[PDB]
Design an enzyme around this catalytic site. Structure first.
Site, PDB file in Angstrom:
ATOM      1  N   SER A 156      41.074  36.683  38.148  1.00 31.50           N
ATOM      2  CA  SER A 156      40.077  37.466  38.801  1.00 31.50           C
ATOM      3  C   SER A 156      38.992  37.819  37.764  1.00 31.50           C
ATOM      4  O   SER A 156      38.506  36.950  36.993  1.00 31.50           O
ATOM      5  CB  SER A 156      40.827  38.641  39.508  1.00 31.50           C
ATOM      6  N   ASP A 207      41.783  31.164  49.356  1.00 34.00           N
ATOM      7  CA  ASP A 207      41.592  32.329  48.505  1.00 34.00           C
ATOM      8  C   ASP A 207      40.481  33.184  49.115  1.00 34.00           C
ATOM      9  O   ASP A 207      39.286  32.747  49.160  1.00 34.00           O
ATOM     10  CB  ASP A 207      41.252  31.896  47.089  1.00 34.00           C
ATOM     11  N   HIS A 217      44.944  34.676  46.744  1.00 33.63           N
ATOM     12  CA  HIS A 217      44.217  35.019  45.536  1.00 33.63           C
ATOM     13  C   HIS A 217      45.085  35.477  44.351  1.00 33.63           C
ATOM     14  O   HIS A 217      44.622  35.617  43.241  1.00 33.63           O
ATOM     15  CB  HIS A 217      43.210  36.120  45.896  1.00 33.63           C
TER      16      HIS A 217
HETATM   17  C1  LIG Z   1      37.051  40.622  47.280  1.00 31.48           C
HETATM   18  C2  LIG Z   1      36.832  42.136  47.233  1.00 31.48           C
HETATM   19  C3  LIG Z   1      37.132  42.789  46.012  1.00 31.48           C
HETATM   20  N1  LIG Z   1      37.447  42.001  44.944  1.00 31.48           N
HETATM   21  C4  LIG Z   1      37.156  42.119  43.634  1.00 31.48           C
HETATM   22  C5  LIG Z   1      36.309  43.121  43.117  1.00 31.48           C
HETATM   23  C6  LIG Z   1      36.145  43.231  41.773  1.00 31.48           C
HETATM   24  C7  LIG Z   1      36.682  42.336  40.888  1.00 31.48           C
HETATM   25  C8  LIG Z   1      37.498  41.314  41.386  1.00 31.48           C
HETATM   26  C9  LIG Z   1      37.740  41.194  42.745  1.00 31.48           C
HETATM   27  C10 LIG Z   1      38.619  40.017  43.155  1.00 31.48           C
HETATM   28  O1  LIG Z   1      38.827  39.879  44.351  1.00 31.48           O
HETATM   29  O2  LIG Z   1      39.104  39.213  42.231  1.00 31.48           O
HETATM   30  C11 LIG Z   1      36.933  44.165  45.914  1.00 31.48           C
HETATM   31  C12 LIG Z   1      36.504  44.921  47.002  1.00 31.48           C
HETATM   32  C13 LIG Z   1      36.247  44.274  48.211  1.00 31.48           C
HETATM   33  C14 LIG Z   1      36.418  42.898  48.336  1.00 31.48           C
HETATM   34  N2  LIG Z   1      36.135  42.354  49.617  1.00 31.48           N
HETATM   35  O3  LIG Z   1      36.807  41.251  50.106  1.00 31.48           O
HETATM   36  O4  LIG Z   1      35.210  42.938  50.459  1.00 31.48           O
END
Ligand SMILES: Cc1c(Nc2ccccc2C(=O)O)cccc1[N+](=O)[O-]
Length: 264
Positions: A94, A215, A244
């Site tokens: 990530s 993912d 993921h």
């Molecule tokens: C995908 C996501 C994340 N994801 C991250 C945020 C920061 C760093 C890595 C991630 C990651 O998915 O690796 C956080 C909040 C909301 C959502 N979303 O799907 O709306």
């Protein structure tokens, strides 16, 4: 030692080859627990917690400092430098994948190889570019995260884990719920605001891009994007793993693929 203590730095294993395992969003270093047995016998494994991890004293999460990825790179480099590591293989899940990329541009000699898991240089859509997310849909998510954090976790964790692996859903939820809600939101804003596409060509170490099926955070085309734009020799591993967080949901298979990438 004070940063090393603050971020729960741990060095384990009986080997001499250094391997850094760098957890990503919503977890801590314990996300590597089921991978570790496959590496303890022949690697010297370095683990730490990102400052935003639920396992770290939230006092260390300074909102005035941690406004971009760069201070997180500072923390990683300080740790490696403090430990006297002058070369390692680095695995970043990530956001730790981007941290490792940036670190490698700063210190080209420190990394023999980067292994990237669930990596994206940009979540947001742009012209030539599918990141997977629209600015509008993402504000709605930030509102839900603020409005009802526990609920957001319970809705998000199954999407992130992806495959129907309830143990991994509960485990990810556990470590998301350990994060202080305003930290989680601020980190999420930080990274949705991040765009690493412009620096990928600067990387010169070989990268192995581990890409799962379906993912939630990373469209297949993003893995192809990294392969085409990272400046060094790149190899995509299209894992027979859905979701993921493959280290949580399919550790045996993930560990075998990691060993293969390291031995390449
Ligand atoms: C995908 C996501 C994340 N994801 C991250 C945020 C920061 C760093 C890595 C991630 C990651 O998915 O690796 C956080 C909040 C909301 C959502 N979303 O799907 O709306």
């Amino acid at each position: 030692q004070t940063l090393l203590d603050a971020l729960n730095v741990r060095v384990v294993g009986s080997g001499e080859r250094v391997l850094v395992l760098a957890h990503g969003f919503g977890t801590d270093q314990s996300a590597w627990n089921r991978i570790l047995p496959f590496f303890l016998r022949d690697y010297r494994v370095v683990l730490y917690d990102l400052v935003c991890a639920g396992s770290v004293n939230p006092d260390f999460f300074d909102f005035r400092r941690y406004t971009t990825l760069d201070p997180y790179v500072d923390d990683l480099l300080h740790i490696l430098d403090a430990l006297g590591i002058d070369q390692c293989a680095y695995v970043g899940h990530s956001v730790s994948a981007m941290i490792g990329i940036l670190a490698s541009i700063r210190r080209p000699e420190l990394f023999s190889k980067l292994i990237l898991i669930g990596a994206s240089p940009r979540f947001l859509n742009d012209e030539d570019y599918h990141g997977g997310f629209e600015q509008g849909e993402i504000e709605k998510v930030f509102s839900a995260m603020e409005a009802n954090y526990e609920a957001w976790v319970n809705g998000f964790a199954p999407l992130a884990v992806g495959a129907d692996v309830p143990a991994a859903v509960r485990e990810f939820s556990r470590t998301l719920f350990n994060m202080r809600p305003d930290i989680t939101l601020f980190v999420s804003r930080t990274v949705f605001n991040s765009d690493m596409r412009g620096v990928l060509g600067l990387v010169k170490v070989p990268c192995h891009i581990f890409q799962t099926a379906r993912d939630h955070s990373v469209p297949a085309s993003v893995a192809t994007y990294l392969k085409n734009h990272l400046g060094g020799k790149n190899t995509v591993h299209w894992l027979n793993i859905e979701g993921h967080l493959p280290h949580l949901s399919a550790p045996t298979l993930l560990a075998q693929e990691l060993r293969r990438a390291l031995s390449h």
